[PDB]
C-alpha cells in the first residue's frame, strides 16, 4: 500500500483525509504532529501511525519519514489574516522557510508532494473566475504588509514548479476555497484547511459577540463542503492516469457564493432554528466596521484531472457545519 505522510495531521484536513484513505484498503497513513486529540479516533487503527513531531524543531526525524513514505502532504502553515501583519516574520519562517526544507526532502528522495497553495495567491485578480493556468496575480505595493502571506505562498509554488521542471519532482498543487464541515481547526491553529471566515462567524454566535462586517461585508467568497473538498484531495492522491502530475488545481464550489454579510445571515438563520440554540447567548447583531472583493474559482482543472464536480448545496453545508459545531461545544 501507498504510504501517505500527513504533516500537521492533528486537525480538519488531517481528520477527514485520514478517514477517507483508511476507508480504502491500499493506504498506510503516517500522521505527524505535536498532538493527536483531533484524530484520536484513529490512533488504534492498524494502518494509521502517529508520529511525534514539529517541522520547526525536527529536521532529521521528518526527513526520515519523507524517505520512508511515498506521498507527502505539508499542512503546517499560519494562514490567519491578523497574523500576516501581526508577526510577519514568524509567518514567513514557518510558512516559507520550514516548508521549503520539506519540499527539498521530497526532491532529494524523489517523493511525490501534494502541496496546499492558497486562493490568496490570485490576490486582487480581476477575472470573475480565478484560473490556475491563465489568471494574473495582483498584489499591492510592498508598503502593504497585508500581502506577505500571499506572495510567500506564491514564491513556494514557483520554487516547486522549478523543481518539477529542472529536477523531476513529482507534484500537484491544490488551492482550497473555504472548506467547511465538522471538526473545524481552532481559529489560531497553524494547520491549513477550514474556512476561517465561517469559523469566526460561528464563534461569534457561540460566544454572543457581534458579526463584524468590514466596510459592509460586501466581499464575496465561495464555500465548499468538506465531503466535496476531501473527495477531490482524495483523487489527487489516487492520481488516476497520472493526470495530476505538474498540475495546479483549485478545489472549491463556485456555486456556493456569498458575501460575508449573506453568509452571516444564513448562519444566523440556521442558528436560531437549531435545537441547541437556547444554550448560547442572544445574538449581538452585525457591526459594520471600516478600517479582495470576490474569489470565485475556475474548476476546469478539477473536472479534467479528477472528473470532480461539487455535489453539496450551500444550505446543506451551512446546516451541517453549524450543527456539528454546536453539538461539540463544551458547555462546562
Curated annotation (Swiss-Prot):
NAD(+) binds at residues 33, 54-55. The keyword Lipid biosynthesis applies. Its EC number is 2.1.2.13, 1.1.1.305. Pathway: Nucleotide-sugar biosynthesis; UDP-4-deoxy-4-formamido-beta-L-arabinose biosynthesis; UDP-4-deoxy-4-formamido-beta-L-arabinose from UDP-alpha-D-glucuronate: step 1/3; Nucleotide-sugar biosynthesis; UDP-4-deoxy-4-formamido-beta-L-arabinose biosynthesis; UDP-4-deoxy-4-formamido-beta-L-arabinose from UDP-alpha-D-glucuronate: step 3/3; Bacterial outer membrane biogenesis; lipopolysaccharide biosynthesis. The chain holds residues 315 to 656 of 660 of the full protein. One of its GO terms (biological process) is UDP-4-deoxy-4-formamido-beta-L-arabinopyranose biosynthetic process. It comes from Escherichia coli (strain K12). The gene is arnA. GO terms for cellular component: membrane; protein-containing complex. Induction: Induced by BasR. Keywords: Antibiotic resistance, Lipid A biosynthesis, Lipid biosynthesis, Lipid metabolism, Lipopolysaccharide biosynthesis, Multifunctional enzyme, NAD, Oxidoreductase, Transferase. This is Bifunctional polymyxin resistance protein ArnA. Bifunctional enzyme that catalyzes the oxidative decarboxylation of UDP-glucuronic acid (UDP-GlcUA) to UDP-4-keto-arabinose (UDP-Ara4O) and the addition of a formyl group to UDP-4-amino-4-deoxy-L-arabinose (UDP-L-Ara4N) to form UDP-L-4-formamido-arabinose (UDP-L-Ara4FN). The modified arabinose is attached to lipid A and is required for resistance to polymyxin and cationic antimicrobial peptides. Disulfide bonds: none annotated. Homohexamer, formed by a dimer of trimers. In the N-terminal section; belongs to the Fmt family. UDP-L-Ara4N formyltransferase subfamily. In the C-terminal section; belongs to the NAD(P)-dependent epimerase/dehydratase family. UDP-glucuronic acid decarboxylase subfamily. It catalyses: UDP-alpha-D-glucuronate + NAD(+) = UDP-beta-L-threo-pentopyranos-4-ulose + CO2 + NADH; UDP-4-amino-4-deoxy-beta-L-arabinose + (6R)-10-formyltetrahydrofolate = UDP-4-deoxy-4-formamido-beta-L-arabinose + (6S)-5,6,7,8-tetrahydrofolate + H(+). One of its GO terms (molecular function) is UDP-glucuronate decarboxylase activity. The active site is at 120 (proton acceptor), 295 (proton donor). UDP-alpha-D-glucuronate binds at residues 79, 84, 118-119, 146, 178, 212-221. Residues 1-332 are annotated as: Dehydrogenase ArnADH.
Amino acid at each position: 500500500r501507498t504510504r501517505v505522510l500527513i504533516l500537521g495531521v492533528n486537525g480538519f484536513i488531517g481528520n477527514h483525509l485520514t478517514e477517507r484513505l483508511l476507508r480504502e484498503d491500499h493506504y498506510e497513513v503516517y500522521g505527524l504532529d505535536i498532538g493527536s486529540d483531533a484524530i484520536s479516533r484513529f490512533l488504534n487503527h492498524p494502518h494509521f501511525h502517529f508520529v511525534e513531531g514539529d517541522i520547526s524543531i525536527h529536521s532529521e526525524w521528518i526527513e526520515y519519514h519523507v524517505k520512508k513514505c511515498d506521498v507527502v502532504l505539508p499542512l503546517v502553515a499560519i494562514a490567519t489574516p491578523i497574523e500576516y501583519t501581526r508577526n510577519p516574520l514568524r509567518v514567513f519562517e514557518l510558512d516559507f522557510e520550514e516548508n521549503l526544507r520539506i519540499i527539498r526532502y521530497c526532491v532529494k528522495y524523489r517523493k511525490r508532494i501534494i502541496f496546499p497553495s492558497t486562493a490568496e495567491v490570485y490576490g486582487m485578480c480581476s477575472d470573475k473566475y480565478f484560473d490556475e493556468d491563465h489568471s494574473n496575480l495582483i498584489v499591492g505595493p510592498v508598503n502593504k504588509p497585508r500581502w506577505i502571506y500571499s506572495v510567500s505562498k506564491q514564491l513556494l509554488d514557483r520554487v516547486i514548479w522549478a523543481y518539477g521542471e529542472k529536477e523531476g519532482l513529482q507534484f500537484t498543487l491544490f488551492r482550497p476555497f473555504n472548506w467547511m464541515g465538522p471538526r473545524l481547526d481552532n481559529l489560531n491553529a497553524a494547520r491549513i484547511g477550514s474556512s476561517r471566515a465561517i469559523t469566526q462567524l460561528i464563534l461569534n454566535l457561540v460566544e454572543g459577540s457581534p458579526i463584524k462586517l468590514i466596510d459592509g461585508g460586501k466581499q464575496k467568497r465561495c464555500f465548499t463542503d468538506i465531503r466535496d473538498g476531501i473527495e477531490a484531495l482524495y483523487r489527487i492522491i489516487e492520481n488516476a492516469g497520472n493526470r495530476c502530475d505538474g498540475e495546479i488545481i483549485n478545489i472549491g464550489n463556485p456555486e456556493n457564493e456569498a458575501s460575508i454579510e449573506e453568509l452571516g445571515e444564513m448562519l444566523l438563520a440556521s442558528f436560531e432554528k437549531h435545537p441547541l440554540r437556547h444554550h448560547f447567548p442572544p445574538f449581538a447583531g452585525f457591526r459594520v466596521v471600516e478600517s479582495v472583493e470576490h474569489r470565485k474559482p475556475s474548476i476546469r482543472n478539477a473536472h479534467r484531472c479528477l472528473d470532480w464536480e461539487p455535489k453539496i448545496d450551500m444550505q446543506e453545508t451551512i446546516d451541517e457545519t453549524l450543527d456539528f459545531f454546536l453539538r461539540t461545544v463544551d458547555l462546562t
